[PDB]
Design a binder for this molecule. Sequence first.
Ligand SMILES: N=C(N)NCCC[C@H](NS(=O)(=O)Cc1ccccc1)C(=O)N1CCC[C@H]1C(=O)NCc1cc(Cl)ccc1CN
Ligand code: NA
Ligand code: NA
Lengths: 28, 250, 11
Amino acid sequence: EADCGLRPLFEKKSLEDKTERELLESYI
Amino acid sequence: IVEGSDAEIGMSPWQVMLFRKSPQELLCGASLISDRWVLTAAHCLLYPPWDKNFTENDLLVRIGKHSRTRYERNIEKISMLEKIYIHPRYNWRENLDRDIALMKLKKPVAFSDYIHPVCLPDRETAASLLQAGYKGRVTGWGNLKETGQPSVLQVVNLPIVERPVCKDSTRIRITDNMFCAGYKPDEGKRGDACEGDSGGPFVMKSPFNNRWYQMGIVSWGEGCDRDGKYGFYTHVFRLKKWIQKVIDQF
Amino acid sequence: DFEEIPEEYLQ
Ligand SMILES: N=C(N)NCCC[C@H](NS(=O)(=O)Cc1ccccc1)C(=O)N1CCC[C@H]1C(=O)NCc1cc(Cl)ccc1CN
Ligand code: NA
Ligand code: NA
């Protein structure tokens, strides 16, 4: 889907979840 | 999920519960990859050592859920299965090599704030993100400990582990169609999938395009959250040609 | 331990 992986209550609202930053910080 | 936390509302809108019709019980996790297709582990549907061989009419999928046991009226959607497809080279006899299956729904599911598909990785996203130390996220309603059960969907973030460490943690033969994840004993932190989390997704959020990709499927582990063991996940990208063949054909 | 689901899905 063209819209896959973009969550209505998070990415589509530019809201982050409480632990996604932990994932980003590991992508070194 | 061992040593995880309660999911936020809408945190994993691709989460699917595989549900047995009679007796009504949870069978596995799964994930929504389009309005008509659900991805799971083959061993959720076929595992002869345990006398497991489900047919379509044995099963339902429940999409949009948060509570494990409640009927989430006006939120979850329950779908019947048109057809199961199991990887033809799934190795249930030895080590669950190629532990992947697809389920086509009888009718398309309507997307909502709680129901939305995850992406499947392309070769470049897989190459970039499938690296030791990089963390993904595992979700499920399975047991909270090896030896109990959650009120709501659980979530845990876990690092991918170097392949030699995965291999050296077990006597089982590890294949290129698997990767392992979890913390090492010296890392302090803990967490794993467990019984009932089978078939659910290991996802990563691409830092290049902001989208969530399903890199793995909860497959197997020696216990749950044991020191020196790791969880093993089906390598989705390695099996994507099969996924594409099934969807294109059916 | 699961709440009953609507009968429409079991028919
Ligand atoms: N009797 C039970 N209900 N569970 C005990 C055996 C658990 C087995 N792991 S093992 O140590 O036996 C190694 C094994 C391996 C794959 C196939 C056969 C054996 C295992 O794991 N299997 C067997 C087929 C299903 C599968 C499974 O239970 N997957 C869920 C699971 C996934 C992850 Cl990522 C982490 C933990 C767990 C729970 N162990
Ligand atoms: Na080994
Ligand atoms: Na461990």
